[PDB]
Amino acid sequence: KKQATENLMKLLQAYKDIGDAKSEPLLKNHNPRTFEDRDYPVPDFRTQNLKAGDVPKFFDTVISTRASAAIASKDKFWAGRKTEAEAASAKASAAFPRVAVPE
Amino acid sequence: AVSKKEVLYFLSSKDAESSTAVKSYLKSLYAGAQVEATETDASELIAQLEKKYLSAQVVEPGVHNIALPLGESGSAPVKRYAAELFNLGAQAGFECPFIEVSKKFGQETATSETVKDVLNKTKSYVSADYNAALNEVLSSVEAEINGPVLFDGKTEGFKKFAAKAKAVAVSRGLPADTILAYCAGSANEDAADKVSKEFFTWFESAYTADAAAEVKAIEAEAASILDRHLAKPVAQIRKEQASAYASLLKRAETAKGAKWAEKYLEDVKAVQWFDASVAEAPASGPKVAA
Amino acid sequence: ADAKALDELRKPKFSSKYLIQHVSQKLIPAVKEWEKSYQP
Amino acid sequence: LSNERYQLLSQWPDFTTMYGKDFYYRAHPEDLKKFYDAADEYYKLYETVTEFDSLSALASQVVPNYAARRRSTVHPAIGSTVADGAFTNFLLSKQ
Numbered sequence: 001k002k003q004a005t006e007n008l009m010k011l012l013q014a015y016k017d018i019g020d021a022k023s024e025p026l027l028k029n030h031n032p033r034t035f036e037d038r039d040y041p042v043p044d045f046r047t048q049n050l051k052a053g054d055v056p057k058f059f060d061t062v063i064s065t066r067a068s069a070a071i072a073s074k075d076k077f078w079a080g081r082k083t084e085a086e087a088a089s090a091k092a093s094a095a096f097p098r099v100a101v102p103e
Numbered sequence: 104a105v106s107k108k109e110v111l112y113f114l115s116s117k118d119a120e121s122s123t124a125v126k127s128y129l130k131s132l133y134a135g136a137q138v139e140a141t142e143t144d145a146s147e148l149i150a151q152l153e154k155k156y157l158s159a160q161v162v163e164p165g166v167h168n169i170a171l172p173l174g175e176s177g178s179a180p181v182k183r184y185a186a187e188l189f190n191l192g193a194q195a196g197f198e199c200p201f202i203e204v205s206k207k208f209g210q211e212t213a214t215s216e217t218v219k220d221v222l223n224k225t226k227s228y229v230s231a232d233y234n235a236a237l238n239e240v241l242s243s244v245e246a247e248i249n250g251p252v253l254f255d256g257k258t259e260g261f262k263k264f265a266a267k268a269k270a271v272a273v274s275r276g277l278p279a280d281t282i283l284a285y286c287a288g289s290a291n292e293d294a295a296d297k298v299s300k301e302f303f304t305w306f307e308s309a310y311t312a313d314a315a316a317e318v319k320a321i322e323a324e325a326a327s328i329l330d331r332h333l334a335k336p337v338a339q340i341r342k343e344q345a346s347a348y349a350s351l352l353k354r355a356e357t358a359k360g361a362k363w364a365e366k367y368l369e370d371v372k373a374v375q376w377f378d379a380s381v382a383e384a385p386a387s388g389p390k391v392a393a
Numbered sequence: 394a395d396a397k398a399l400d401e402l403r404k405p406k407f408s409s410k411y412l413i414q415h416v417s418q419k420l421i422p423a424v425k426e427w428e429k430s431y432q433p
Numbered sequence: 434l435s436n437e438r439y440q441l442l443s444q445w446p447d448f449t450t451m452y453g454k455d456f457y458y459r460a461h462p463e464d465l466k467k468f469y470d471a472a473d474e475y476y477k478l479y480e481t482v483t484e485f486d487s488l489s490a491l492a493s494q495v496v497p498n499y500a501a502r503r504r505s506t507v508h509p510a511i512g513s514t515v516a517d518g519a520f521t522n523f524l525l526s527k528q
Contacts, residue, residue, distance in 0.1 A: 001471070001474060001478070002441065002444065002445055002446075004471065005445065005446060005448060005468075005471040005472075005474075005475070006446050008464065008467055008468045008471055009446055009448065009451055009468070011460075011464055012451050012456050012459070012460050012464065012465075012468060013451075015456075015459045015460040015461065015464070016455065016456055016459040016460070019459040020459075026454070026455070026458040026459070027458060030458060030462070078461045078462070081461060082461050082464070085461075094446075096446035096447060096450070097446070097447045097450060098443065098444055098445065098446060098447060099442075099443070099445050099446070099447050099448075099449075099475070100447075101439075101442065101443045101479070103443075109414075118403075118404065118405075119400055119401075119402075119403035119404035119405075120404040120410075122400070123400055123401075145425060146428070148428060149421070149424065149425055149428060152420075152421070152424070153417070153421060155506065156413060156416065156417035156420065156421070157417070159413045159504055160410050160413050160414055160417070162503065162504060162509050163408050163409045163410045163413055163500065163504060164404065164405050164408045164410050165509075166408075166499075166500050166503040166504075166509065167405035167407075167408040167496075167500065168403075168405050171499075174434075185510055188503070188509045188510035189510050191509055191510075192508050192509045192510055195509075197508050197509070200507070200508040200510050200511045200515050200519075201515060201518075201519050201522075203507055203508045203511070204507050204508065204511055204515065204516045204519045205519045205522060205523055207506075207507050208519070208520065208523040209523065218524075221524070225520065225523075228507070228516050228520075229513075229516060229517060229520050230513040230514075230516070230517050233513075233517050233520070237524075254528045255527070255528060256526070256527025256528055257527065261527075265524070265525050268521075268524060268525060269521070269525055272517075272518075272521045272525075275517065277514070277517060277518045277521065279518075279521040279525060282518050282519075282521055282522050283521070283522060283525055283526065286522050286526075305518065306515070306518075309514045309515045309518055310510060310512075310514075310515055312512075312514050313511075313512025313513060313514045313515065314510065314512070316512065317502070317512065321495060321499060324495055324498075325434065325491075325492070325495055326434055328491055328494055328495065329434050329435065329438075329488075329491060330438075332481075332487065332491060333435075333438060333478070333481055333482055335481060336477055336480075336481065337477075337480045337481045337484050340481065340484060340487050341484075341487075344487060344490045347490070348490065361415065362411050362414065362415055363409075363411035363412050363414070363415050366411050367407070370406035370407055373406060374406065376397065380395065380396075383395075389402070390395055390396040390397070391396065391397070391398065391399050391402060392396045392397060392398050392399070393399065407493075407496075408500070409500070409504075
């Protein structure tokens with residue numbers, strides 16, 4: 001447990017240092033709007049043969065499938081960010097201060 | 104009060120709640136009271152059973168006044184701990200442990216005629232990897248006899264067993280020839296003390312190594328009890344130890360009028376006195392009248 | 394009350410000694426009468 | 434014994450030096466749940482090793498099994514090594 005907590009701080013220092021090396025914004029990669037493809041060809045509801053009430057149900061599945069592909073593209077960034085830090089935290093020092101407990 | 108067979112067991116005893124029963128009895132004989140006649144009755148079965156239940160009233164407070172040498176380095180805290188149990192058993196009327204377990208062997212097997220029966224009626228009192236190690240030797244010697252070995256000594260087949268039963272005992276680590284020459288005595292006391300001083304270096308290495316094996320089990324029980332307890336959250340511990348304190352006060356508070364339960368609650372009120380006395384002056388400790 | 398004694402404080406508290414005594418006060422009179430009334 | 438386990442909770446790395454929001458937003462969100470649960474586990478371990486009022490009721494679970502071993506019918510100080518060496522005195526003498 002002491003080594004797992006020391007592995008996590010080596011990771012959280014590696015997440016910070018490979019983020020500050022790119023100097024990227026803080027909330028950029030936690031915002032799934034930045035992973036959203038807005039140049040997508042945006043389907044026409046007039047070529048889908050919809051009836052009267054069937055159009056707002058069509059609009060929601062286009063909004064779902066493009067939000068759910070924007071979160072799933074956010075999960076693919078952090079799944080690739082992890083291995084860049086999980087393989088760079090292992091090559092570190094881990095010189096951390098110890099918790100102040102009474103001697 | 105005492106029934107005079109308690110107070111005879113508490114004369115040479117040294118603990119507190121028995122010696123204040125003796126000092127209260129010795130003050131009563133001084134104030135013109137006559138001493139009860141000691142009964143010469145209750146033949147051999149009841150006489151040896153009252154010794155079982157009167158010596159255990161001397162051993163049981165005496166064991167609780169002997170500090171275990173847990174987590175100590177050296178052989179002198181184990182030779183302190185064992186010698187406190189030697190001197191405790193002597194106050195309870197036991198003899199030497201060598202004399203008392205050899206009495207236990209001859210009591211169990213007074214009518215054992217075969218060596219396979221003496222190895223199975225003294226089974227509870229011998230180390231089981233020594234009792235089994237005397238069964239490969241009994242089965243090996245049984246091959247050259249092809250008849251049951253008798254517990255005679257004058258039988259040649261017993262000397263064929265005791266030629267190889269002694270061969271195990273030296274391989275186990277215990278000098279059997281210095282044991283056997285101690286309990287046989289000797290002619291001159293000068294060479295009787297060369298075997299006395301080699302028995303008692305086995306015996307001091309014997310009573311230490313099983314006083315130390317009794318400590319190293321308490322060290323390993325307390326370390327497995329603690330490491331089972333350090334894995335809990337602190338709120339679970341506080342309610343697990345509050346139910347056990349409640350259910351065990353309740354067991355002593357249901358039993359009313361019993362001697363052990365009204366003495367149990369006088370100990371709870373005396374534990375609370377110790378906490379209340381330390382809370383008044385904690386750099387000095389509990390207050391003794393002195 | 395406070396400042397009890399020494400020989401009152403030297404006794405080990407939660408030892409048995411009175412379960413052994415309570416058994417010995419109920420085993421011994423109940424087995425002294427068994428040996429005086431025994432035929433197989 | 435509770436001091437030896439306290440001494441290895443003393444060598445735990447300071448996790449509160451990484452509670453800033455510049456460590457929050459740089460980190461993978463699942464490796465921040467693990468880090469915020471690894472800090473909540475230290476306070477579980479540290480509050481149960483400094484529960485020194487629990488050690489008195491733990492020592493009472495060791496006493497009754499020990500005192501019943503000393504309440505032997507042979508001797509309080511008997512053990513196997515004395516009883517083995519008093520078996521060879523019993524066996525290797527003539528019955």
